[PDB]
Design a protein around this ligand. Structure first.
Ligand code: MG
Ligand code: MG
Ligand code: MG
Ligand code: MG
Ligand code: MG
Ligand code: MG
Ligand code: MG
Ligand code: MG
Ligand code: MG
Lengths: 521, 521, 521
């Protein structure tokens, strides 16, 4: 679209539409875009931000571009719509996206004698493009701040785009890449113009928005014995002189733990157990030393949140895996060393039906060959890669959590469900990059070859709309008794949950997952 | 409609058109809309406004939206047109509505060094929508200020939209609802754009713009006796020793009070009688203690104005029911404890032909079983719900009074004529909500996740037009003698009634009802 | 249908099918039918059952017929299906019914020498008809035992049909009617035969399966004053000598109780308040003396549950109206003077938004004419019939409660929603009457005129299927925040709710209503 200065280039579209097997979410927001980096590209590294350890070293570039991020479920679903989703469906997945930018306003700022003057610069442009061929480092999928706000009335600033390449400490290597975003075709928009983009999601598995009502070790008929036998006795019982024997039994109703089974619990990468009650924990600094890590090219990274494992076993709700769960901040919570009361620790207990508990061993294996003089020895398995016959559930998604991630362009990518939860896509929603076009201030009247460094101070503002179509897998529960449902609490409160307070601040008081409904295994 | 900055988006349309059985009213006004709540939604309650009693406790939200209110007859009818209506018609009802917003101007306000600068912000928008599916609390119908002014030359400010939900004192409950109006599709308008809406009224009964020339107790032929008998004597007359007897008589011309009749006067909910002359009243505070009330979930509300009852009986014009009549303010009258000379108390004496007097008993009922040792006992009926055979008239409408109300979405709704007077509609003219779109001021040049709280100061102004088509029921009076008509008074005055004074202030000097013409019962 | 002895005449059909705006429920059960009254019709009265008081006197007849009763929601909806209904819909109503009887077995019982022999009587019949023209007293709608069991595996006995006519004490009157059910055409079925019937429900209002999120006294805009005035002062404030005055104010945000309003709360018939905690109640017998009653032809009946009124006001959950709520029994609870822990008292608190609290006055009315020597007097209104402008909600329905009732064939029937809750139908599902055809034992070989009184002992058994199609009004909540939903409790339990225990007994642990979702008023 193209029109004049006094004509609106779009309307406000916020609402959800529920049809048969589909839901279409639409959210509109107002954004503001500053000029970033005074129009420059800059080399950055851990030595440019300060510098401390090799584990945290990097090299990259900060760019003068901003970008759009709507990779959080709350950018699309109101809490009520989320409730409608999770209480009634066994699965969902994204199908298509439509994105629009409109009602663009470019503003000039003049700073003289302490006076603050903001005027419309009717002839200035913004630049917008989509990285539809995935030629730039993809930073969506790294759970960054800068998303479309959950509350439609909230105005937000667009985040600055930067990227990383290869480093050796704070230095670049020959394989290090530099990208110039002006080396891309971009649309130029004045105040009368608008931008639109459409995208189709690839076929991805439905997210499992249910919990299992059976455990993997309890799939048998509890009334009938097995025809198969297990070794039940290795030593004679009774008398004074106990000797070697071999006794075999059939597993049955009272020996379910010994029964022959067809399947195995999902893979494990053991995490340390932390109590939500500080007094139950060790008096030492183990946030790093006791952490579960991966080692890549001489540096350690936290495995966070890592493989989908259950948070805790039965009646152990006060424990969580050190870095094995998503942890969200309560409204207004600060960046550093905030108390437990300022965060919301997610609970993945529902997957304990098929997935090992994050803080316990996967199991026990034999480590020797027993004989007359050597007793049978076993060891705990704290890391268990995939085995044939293993089954598992992936991590849940949350209203305030991420939606998708880009699957790394690699030769191998086993079960590429992103570990933070969500949908793994080889070709995800592309990065939408935006910047204010530099407008030079008055040049000298004698030629000078130097690049111009005096610009008129500008920012831009407008509206953004994002529409996502989602496919649903409706609940078909043949269970007799009522199910668990997400419900607001009936009792009297100073404020209503998922609303604004007396000062106009919107808050999300808790994480809301998707696994309320149940099904058999 | 969509056009440029130098082109008008509409014309001024104010006038009435009288046809055969229809009148089309059109009024145009100029409005101004500020930014409300600094773009925020806020939780409000009786503790946020102060707090005193449980009877006045509430919980709700203030929104940054304004709304249009033209739910008063004087927004559509000039006093002369009202006179034409009431002097010539026995009834009327609304049929259709057309609403337009045009000649939108968005203005930026700059406050530096005490200097007041107002400039046009040619690229800013307003947002407008109609709640056509009645998904929001409906506040029209609660006789609020903020209507289109009666005088076409008067410029008005649009009122702020807020709503209530359930409360327990100043606190919310689980059933309490929060609504975000940005969760609705709304049209975005710049200075070249306009908005239009059309609506059709459902079939509603005509308002009875007449008074009855017969009373319910005087429908008989005054020359002829009845064939039916009543009990006229229970004791012998004459002598020294009076004994029990049963004597029966036929009602006739001199015993109309005893005649058999087919109908009953309308229902009653008794109000206290107050004299317009202070000296005739009791020396106590009874505005609340002597008030007629309803009790709902532990709190009392005034029954105001309540069931349509006649204001007073014959030659008792100085008395009014405590809260049983509409009371309007004279021009410029203040909010609190104003004298009687500052208000205009309506008079519903015309309905005393079928409806009980508001301040008297409905009648008398027997309370015992009389016999030799027990005398017949009766009691006053101060509350009388509907009985088969009851007939009544609804409350009159006034030039300065309300037009419609939304019938509550309930299972039962007996004779849903709104008690303040007017037309009860299940699907009334929808709420038209409007706001100024927030325009952020210059954002920081380093990304910050916090919602933006610095905006450019703006307001909007434009024109609004409302057109209503009304259906008329023409007077067909077969009466020989002249009727009562509303007339201006012939005598010399300092000012003419329903005009402006020497300072340019328009005033409405009296309430004007609709019941001048008469008809039989 | 008609077939042989070795061929099944029908299949087991139990399941629900959810479509767009419809749900079809199907339940199949096994029944047993004895011979009732040894094939006789008998006159019954309070003198035939014992006799105590005139309030309990009756006259009627016991018949040898049984009948089918499926007038309870749990005969059709599993608890899970009920949850699906109430969490997702704003209303529902019945549309059509299909009824089938099949796999009929007639059994002969022989009692000789203490030996119990049961054999098939392949040539015996049962008789079945529908009272499709409503020519018999309709006893469905009187909340009787004998319904299709909620649990599909439970086998039930069909109840005996009897009816009442007019009485004067234990005696009949001339207007008393006697009905012979053999004076009707009935189908005769042997073991190879089946019976089918179809019915269509008349247009009835949807049941309101929601609660209001607004109260009737809080429909105003909380930010704006009214243009209307009320009488706020009757006496001067300040000084030593307080005198009569008239002061008027406009209702506003802090005077919501005084604001002019259009509507009135629903009708009232006051009930006594009883605490669920025995120690808070009076130490007297008031179950009858303190009861709310109606008086009909010299006898008193309890008003039970009576007009739909709210059970209690805010923070008063321990109180219930004496006979103003439905009270269900827990599984196995006995007929007489059972403890509070054996019953389940329903709570109608959700309707307090429009309906008066059952145990409080409707309001207050004026009872006199105040003047200099007479102070303003008011009285409580404990009975309030319908007034124009009243709005209300009807009583909720429950999973274990009744579905419909027959509207009495009368000249007048105001808002004929059955007071126990449910759907009022002029032409309800007809009575389905069934009996075992008498099979005489060996007659004498010499003629005797006396009716035969020696029969072979028989009973019958078979299956019954009932299919109801229901229309739904889907929830379209534009509320931002999550709603209340019915949910099973997440915590560990010895048994799961709405399941069987270790002995195979099914129980319904609580009443489940339909008002979880909310909407504005
Ligand atoms: Mg977000
Ligand atoms: Mg847990
Ligand atoms: Mg690659
Ligand atoms: Mg007005
Ligand atoms: Mg008068
Ligand atoms: Mg409603
Ligand atoms: Mg039952
Ligand atoms: Mg309650
Ligand atoms: Mg009848």
């Amino acid at each position: 679209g193209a029109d004049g200065v006094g004509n609106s280039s779009g309307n406000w579209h916020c609402d959800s539409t529920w049809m048969g097997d589909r839901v279409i979410t639409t959210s509109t927001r107002t954004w503001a875009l500053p000029t970033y980096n005074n129009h420059l590209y800059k080399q950055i590294s851990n030595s440019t931000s300060g510098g401390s350890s090799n584990d945290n070293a990097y090299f990259g570039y900060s760019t003068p571009w901003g970008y759009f991020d709507f990779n959080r479920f709350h950018c699309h679903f109101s809490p009520r719509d989320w409730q409608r989703l999770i209480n009634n469906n066994w699965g969902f997945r994204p199908k298509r996206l439509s994105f629009k930018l409109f009602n663009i306003q470019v503003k000039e700022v003049t700073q003289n004698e302490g006076t603050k003057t903001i005027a419309n610069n009717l002839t200035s442009t913004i630049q917008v493009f989509t990285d539809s061929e995935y030629q730039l480092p993809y930073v969506l999928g790294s759970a960054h701040q800068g998303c479309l706000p959950p509350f439609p009335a909230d105005v937000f600033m667009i985040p600055q785009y930067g990227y990383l390449t290869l480093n050796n400490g704070s230095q670049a290597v020959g394989r290090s890449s530099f990208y110039c975003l002006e080396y891309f075709p971009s649309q130029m928009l004045r105040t009368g113009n608008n931008f639109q983009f459409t995208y189709t999601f690839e076929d991805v598995p439905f997210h499992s928005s249910y919990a299992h009502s059976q455990s993997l070790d309890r799939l048998m008929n509890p009334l009938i014995d097995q025809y198969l036998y297990y070794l039940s006795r290795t030593q004679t019982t009774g008398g004074t002189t106990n000797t070697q024997t071999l006794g075999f039994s059939q597993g049955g109703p009272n020996t379910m733990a010994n029964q022959a089974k067809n399947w195995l619990p999902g893979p494990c990468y053991r995490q340390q157990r932390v109590s939500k009650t500080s007094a139950d924990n060790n008096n030492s600094e183990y946030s790093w030393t006791g952490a579960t890590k991966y080692h890549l090219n001489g540096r350690d990274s936290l495995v966070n949140p890592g493989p989908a494992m259950a948070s805790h076993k039965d009646d152990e709700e006060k424990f969580f895996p050190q870095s094995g769960v998503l942890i969200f901040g309560k409204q207004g919570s600060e960046k550093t060393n905030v108390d437990i009361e300022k965060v919301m620790i997610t609970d993945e207990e529902e997957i304990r039906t098929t997935n090992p508990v994050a803080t316990e061993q996967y199991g026990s294996v034999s480590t020797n060959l027993q004989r007359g003089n050597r007793q049978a020895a076993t060891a705990d398995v704290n890391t268990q890669g995939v085995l044939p016959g293993m089954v598992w559930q992936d991590r849940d998604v949350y209203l305030q959590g991420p939606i998708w991630a880009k699957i790394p362009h690699t030769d191998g990518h086993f079960h590429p469900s992103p570990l933070m939860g969500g949908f793994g896509l080889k070709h995800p929603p592309p990065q939408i990059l935006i910047k204010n076009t530099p407008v030079p201030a008055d040049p000298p009247t004698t030629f000078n070859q130097s690049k111009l460094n005096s610009f008129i101070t500008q920012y831009s503002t407008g509206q953004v709309s994002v529409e996502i179509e989602w496919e649903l897998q409706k609940e078909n529960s043949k269970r007799w008794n009522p199910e668990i449902q997400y419900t607001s609490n009936y009792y009297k409160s100073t404020s209503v949950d998922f609303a604004v307070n007396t000062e106009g601040v919107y808050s999300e008081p808790r994480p809301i997952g998707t696994r309320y409904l149940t099904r058999n295994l």
